[PDB]
Homo-oligomer: A and B are copies of this chain.
């Protein structure tokens, strides 16, 4: 379940075997130095040895830094946790800011435990269940077949109860798990003898299973560290895993959990898969948060943190002095900064073509040039938004291609920041100013 989002066009970093960024691949365009740095960080993360490094992504708005993070996440792929949060999420009311940050960090450490399970899988030949009226004793036995073997089993009380709950019928194909005891109906073998109800709802036949009737299979349990913390924090913590409201979990629990996980790793019971945490608009964070971040990176079970910021020199929140990137020098000294540059014209034109391809919008060459010129003049995001509006205008025109006139109409109807600013400056009397004065009447 997904829709075409602002970063839906990028499927990775698009790098070669020698970490040399391809000029355009996997959706990403240009930004070669930053993509190379991202690839180096990617290899460091995939190695899994370096812990608690902090990396900062800096540069002007719209220069793809959040796209760079999305590409990094796509390169990580599944089975490696990636927690993307914003600075605005940290300031909560039910948790201390350091508690919220701790919960965020522990969401970024993944534990994989592999287990081997014995599985029975069959076609049902017949099932029998002898239960005494006004009595609790029940007797049953099951016959279950495979293409190469058939066997009978005599059923215990719990197995009888489970099979009765599942309403197994002989024309079912089903698997039996000897440990869990759950029964899953895989499909149907033949028809229901044409009873006068449920006539043709079983047409989707399934093939008989083949091989040993009782076969061993492996199951992998992927769980984050934060989930384990919530599970072991209190008795009601499992409900809190979905409801929230976990409370401010005691630190001693965290210390014991860290020791236990360290023992599990050294024992080979569990495999730890650290991931990457991405913070958006970090400058929103408080100096108390950055103070906690300084120590939090030093921990051995910490992920690798990447921070997006663009405000340049600005007053750090909680203090009365400006700081080089909105962040204190305490955090700035311990972090490696990767930079992003403004885009050339050709990079913008190819980004626009890629976005139109992703949105399934067919742009004519002259229309593509006009849209690129508009994007170069004002902003890449503005032209990106204009693409879909032009497509809708073309559809309204009953044409299968987007022409230049559609783009012109979209420009005329919908404004950019500069045009709105100019129209405001010309007509300041029609809007409410900071001093609370405005003319509502026209005479």
Contacts and interface: CB of A to CB of B under 8 A. Distances in A.
A206 interface: no
Contact of A436 (B328, B432, B438, B440): B328
A434 interface: yes
A435 interface: yes
Interface in A248-287: none
Copies in the complex: 2
A379 interface: no
A5 B437 CA distance: 41
A323 interface: yes
A436 B321 CA distance: 7
A333 interface: yes
Contacts of A49: none
Contacts of A323: 436
A316 B432 CA distance: 15
A329 interface: yes
A2 interface: no
Interface-central residue, A333, A434, A436, A440, by most chain B CB under 10 Å: A436
Interface string A322-353: 11000011100100000000000000000000
Interface string A297-331: 00000000000000000001001011100001110
Contacts of A436: 316, 319, 321-323, 328-329
Nearest to A437: B329
Contacts of A329: 432, 436-438, 440
Contacts of A321: 434-436
Nearest to A328: B436
Contacts of A316: 436
A358 B83 CA distance: 57
A316 B329 CA distance: 34
A434 B440 CA distance: 42
A440 B331 CA distance: 12
Contacts of A438: 329
A97 B333 CA distance: 42
Contacts of A328: 436
Contacts of A333: 440
A330 B319 CA distance: 34
Interface in A397-443: 432, 434-438, 440
A239 B323 CA distance: 50
Nearest to A319: B436
A437 to B, nearest CB: 8
A94 to B, nearest CB: 13
A325 to B, nearest CB: 12
A320 to B, nearest CB: 9
A99 to B, nearest CB: 15
A316 B319 CA distance: 23
Interface string A96-116: 000000000000000000000
15 contacts: A316-B436, A319-B436, A321-B434, A321-B435, A321-B436, A322-B436, A323-B436, A328-B436, A329-B432, A329-B436, A329-B437, A329-B438, A329-B440, A330-B432, A333-B440
Given A321-B435, A330-B432, 13 more contacts: A316-B436, A319-B436, A321-B434, A321-B436, A322-B436, A323-B436, A328-B436, A329-B432, A329-B436, A329-B437, A329-B438, A329-B440, A333-B440
